[PDB]
Design an enzyme around this catalytic site. Sequence first.
Site, mmCIF file in Angstrom:
data_model
loop_
_atom_site.group_PDB
_atom_site.id
_atom_site.type_symbol
_atom_site.label_atom_id
_atom_site.label_comp_id
_atom_site.label_asym_id
_atom_site.label_seq_id
_atom_site.Cartn_x
_atom_site.Cartn_y
_atom_site.Cartn_z
ATOM 1 N N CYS A 132 138.917 -17.457 -62.995
ATOM 2 C CA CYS A 132 138.142 -18.674 -63.557
ATOM 3 C C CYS A 132 138.969 -19.614 -64.082
ATOM 4 O O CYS A 132 139.729 -19.436 -64.968
ATOM 5 C CB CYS A 132 137.165 -18.234 -64.619
ATOM 6 N N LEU A 133 138.788 -20.888 -63.380
ATOM 7 C CA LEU A 133 139.585 -22.149 -63.827
ATOM 8 C C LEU A 133 138.912 -22.961 -64.980
ATOM 9 O O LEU A 133 139.756 -23.494 -65.684
ATOM 10 C CB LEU A 133 139.715 -23.109 -62.652
ATOM 11 N N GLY A 134 137.820 -22.545 -65.526
ATOM 12 C CA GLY A 134 137.039 -23.179 -66.484
ATOM 13 C C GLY A 134 137.357 -22.253 -67.929
ATOM 14 O O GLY A 134 136.541 -22.769 -69.017
ATOM 15 N N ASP B 34 125.805 -23.819 -65.987
ATOM 16 C CA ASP B 34 125.282 -22.280 -66.152
ATOM 17 C C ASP B 34 125.864 -21.374 -67.045
ATOM 18 O O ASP B 34 125.401 -20.496 -67.607
ATOM 19 C CB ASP B 34 124.912 -21.821 -64.838
ATOM 20 N N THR B 35 127.240 -21.310 -66.991
ATOM 21 C CA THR B 35 127.987 -19.866 -67.170
ATOM 22 C C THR B 35 127.950 -19.841 -68.748
ATOM 23 O O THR B 35 127.475 -19.173 -69.657
ATOM 24 C CB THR B 35 129.440 -20.058 -66.870
ATOM 25 N N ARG C 54 119.734 -17.972 -60.259
ATOM 26 C CA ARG C 54 118.579 -17.017 -60.623
ATOM 27 C C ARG C 54 117.489 -17.578 -59.837
ATOM 28 O O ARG C 54 116.496 -18.475 -60.720
ATOM 29 C CB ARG C 54 118.343 -17.079 -61.961
HETATM 30 C C1 HEM Z 1 131.352 -18.068 -70.079
HETATM 31 C C2 HEM Z 1 131.867 -18.989 -69.227
HETATM 32 C C3 HEM Z 1 132.229 -18.377 -67.592
HETATM 33 C C4 HEM Z 1 132.250 -17.192 -66.936
HETATM 34 C C5 HEM Z 1 131.948 -16.026 -67.577
HETATM 35 C C6 HEM Z 1 132.794 -17.630 -65.755
HETATM 36 C C7 HEM Z 1 133.165 -16.877 -64.727
HETATM 37 C C8 HEM Z 1 133.806 -16.943 -63.606
HETATM 38 C C9 HEM Z 1 134.343 -15.802 -62.430
HETATM 39 C C10 HEM Z 1 133.721 -14.468 -62.746
HETATM 40 C C11 HEM Z 1 134.728 -16.305 -61.362
HETATM 41 C C12 HEM Z 1 135.286 -15.850 -60.153
HETATM 42 C C13 HEM Z 1 134.073 -15.881 -59.105
HETATM 43 C C14 HEM Z 1 134.758 -15.291 -57.870
HETATM 44 O O1 HEM Z 1 136.022 -14.754 -57.725
HETATM 45 O O2 HEM Z 1 133.923 -15.351 -56.791
HETATM 46 C C15 HEM Z 1 134.900 -17.855 -61.743
HETATM 47 C C16 HEM Z 1 135.550 -19.160 -61.243
HETATM 48 C C17 HEM Z 1 135.505 -20.423 -61.100
HETATM 49 N N1 HEM Z 1 135.004 -20.922 -62.405
HETATM 50 FE FE1 HEM Z 1 134.266 -19.912 -64.070
HETATM 51 N N2 HEM Z 1 133.190 -18.690 -65.581
HETATM 52 C C18 HEM Z 1 132.919 -19.524 -66.674
HETATM 53 C C19 HEM Z 1 133.068 -20.787 -67.079
HETATM 54 C C20 HEM Z 1 133.280 -21.805 -66.272
HETATM 55 C C21 HEM Z 1 133.417 -23.248 -66.571
HETATM 56 C C22 HEM Z 1 132.653 -23.991 -67.852
HETATM 57 C C23 HEM Z 1 133.848 -23.780 -65.588
HETATM 58 C C24 HEM Z 1 134.105 -25.557 -65.389
HETATM 59 C C25 HEM Z 1 133.798 -26.034 -64.319
HETATM 60 C C26 HEM Z 1 133.915 -22.907 -64.498
HETATM 61 C C27 HEM Z 1 134.822 -23.189 -63.309
HETATM 62 C C28 HEM Z 1 135.165 -22.359 -62.469
HETATM 63 C C29 HEM Z 1 135.805 -22.517 -61.084
HETATM 64 C C30 HEM Z 1 136.158 -24.195 -60.472
HETATM 65 C C31 HEM Z 1 135.869 -21.307 -60.464
HETATM 66 C C32 HEM Z 1 136.558 -20.948 -59.026
HETATM 67 C C33 HEM Z 1 138.019 -20.362 -59.053
HETATM 68 C C34 HEM Z 1 138.409 -20.205 -57.616
HETATM 69 O O3 HEM Z 1 137.672 -20.025 -56.752
HETATM 70 O O4 HEM Z 1 139.634 -20.587 -57.365
HETATM 71 N N3 HEM Z 1 133.683 -21.929 -65.118
HETATM 72 N N4 HEM Z 1 134.203 -18.204 -63.131
HETATM 73 C C1 LIG Z 2 130.170 -16.964 -59.721
HETATM 74 C C2 LIG Z 2 130.431 -18.360 -60.412
HETATM 75 C C3 LIG Z 2 130.338 -18.130 -62.005
HETATM 76 C C4 LIG Z 2 131.797 -19.015 -60.109
HETATM 77 C C5 LIG Z 2 131.650 -20.349 -60.639
HETATM 78 C C6 LIG Z 2 130.443 -20.824 -60.643
HETATM 79 C C7 LIG Z 2 129.663 -19.453 -59.951
HETATM 80 C C8 LIG Z 2 128.122 -19.363 -59.899
HETATM 81 C C9 LIG Z 2 130.200 -19.538 -58.509
HETATM 82 O O1 LIG Z 2 129.463 -20.016 -57.476
HETATM 83 C C10 LIG Z 2 131.955 -19.261 -58.517
#
Ligand code: HEM
Ligand SMILES: CC1(C)[C@@H]2CC[C@@]1(C)C(=O)C2
EC number: 1.14.15.1
Length: 404
Positions: free
Chosen positions: A347-349, A241-242, A176
């Site tokens: 999402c891995l998290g 952030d998420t 943002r």
């Molecule tokens: C409400 C919480 C969360 C939401 C809604 C969310 C949402 C997402 C989404 C939509 C993606 C796919 C993005 C794409 O395909 O370009 C993603 C990927 C990812 N997120 Fe989450 N996320 C959350 C929490 C977290 C947290 C806490 C972590 C901790 C590090 C995390 C780590 C990652 C990683 C490493 C990926 C990349 C997976 C890949 O590219 O193979 N996320 N997330």
């Molecule tokens: C779109 C996302 C939520 C996902 C994990 C962090 C984020 C901002 C990315 O750049 C990939």
Amino acid sequence: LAPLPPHVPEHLVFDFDMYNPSNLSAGVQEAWAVLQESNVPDLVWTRCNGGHWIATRGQLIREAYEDYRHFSSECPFIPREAGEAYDFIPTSMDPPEQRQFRALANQVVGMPVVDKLENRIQELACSLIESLRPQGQCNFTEDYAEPFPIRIFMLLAGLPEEDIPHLKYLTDQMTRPDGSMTFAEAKEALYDYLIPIIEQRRQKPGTDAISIVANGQVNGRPITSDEAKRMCGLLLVGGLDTVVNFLSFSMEFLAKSPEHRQELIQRPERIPAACEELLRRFSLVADGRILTSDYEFHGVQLKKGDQILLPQMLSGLDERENACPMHVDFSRQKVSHTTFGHGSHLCLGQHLARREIIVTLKEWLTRIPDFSIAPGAQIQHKSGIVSGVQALPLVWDPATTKAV
Ligand code: HEM
Ligand SMILES: CC1(C)[C@@H]2CC[C@@]1(C)C(=O)C2
Ligand SMILES: [K+]
Ligand SMILES: [Xe]
Ligand SMILES: [Xe]
Ligand SMILES: [Xe]
Ligand SMILES: [Xe]
């Protein structure tokens, strides 16, 4: 507003600004949901933010995320200069290359790690809420939503809490932006932070997430320092952030809906189902892909190099996926969403996020069962790659609370 490309027909132009959408005062999800009114086509072009496609329906969003040969994650952010500078791992890689980096990232944020952190997650939640409980008020975004997930992440990463303001500032500029920093500047500042730490933990490996990434292997060979930095930076953005933002939408809702609080107080075992339905309704992420070639998609000619926003947020708000989509129903039979993405970049998290959400709901409702938005407050949202809540003043009567 940017010049309409030759190949885009005039009848598909809907001028949606993802960083400042027109109807933002009705709520950020409601503002994005104007792309799903009866007159709006399944797939539109906006001249905002340099010009890009936007798929508006779940079926299109899912299809494009599945089809990585046409819809590449090499350039996943809008505007184009952010997408071009974006090189985080694994998100900027397509399969097959991407796959080896997911396994390593699962080592630091996967379910076995959540299981290990479960004690510290519960402890921090209880400690923050008990501190707030006798006050009868809080600024929820700053008093809980930020510190709870951020401190857990800093713990896991082995980083000092004094660094939080700096890192939170940078991550916010990537999702943002306020104008002070381009995406590429924010990204290089984050890397600059990480480089010496990654070098230290390669010389002196420890137990923390940076050590694990930096000393790790990807399909049987050592990760480079450069690869480690690009993965660690992604994890930071995910951590800072998420969940932070999602907690605020969820709490705003609960503060406005006494019957929904009552449902979870009466039947706490429904909290996992309620988390899922809140993840659908207050979905908050919208990134995208770039076309690897000319491609006709659902009646619309796309050109090689075009960018398309595929708003993860929109799929579960789609009436065609979920009946009465703006209504929150904890008993909703089939909760369909793409909140945690779709396809090979799922999402891995998500297991960590669910845990933090579930722990928050259980521990907040046990101690502060009844609360409201402070008298007079109008809650303002903000839109971007990850949407958010600017501030959330809550009040309650301490006499109705209980120390546990
Ligand atoms: C409400 C919480 C969360 C939401 C809604 C969310 C949402 C997402 C989404 C939509 C993606 C796919 C993005 C794409 O395909 O370009 C993603 C990927 C990812 N997120 Fe989450 N996320 C959350 C929490 C977290 C947290 C806490 C972590 C901790 C590090 C995390 C780590 C990652 C990683 C490493 C990926 C990349 C997976 C890949 O590219 O193979 N996320 N997330
Ligand atoms: C779109 C996302 C939520 C996902 C994990 C962090 C984020 C901002 C990315 O750049 C990939
Ligand atoms: K890129
Ligand atoms: Xe992490
Ligand atoms: Xe990390
Ligand atoms: Xe929450
Ligand atoms: Xe509860």
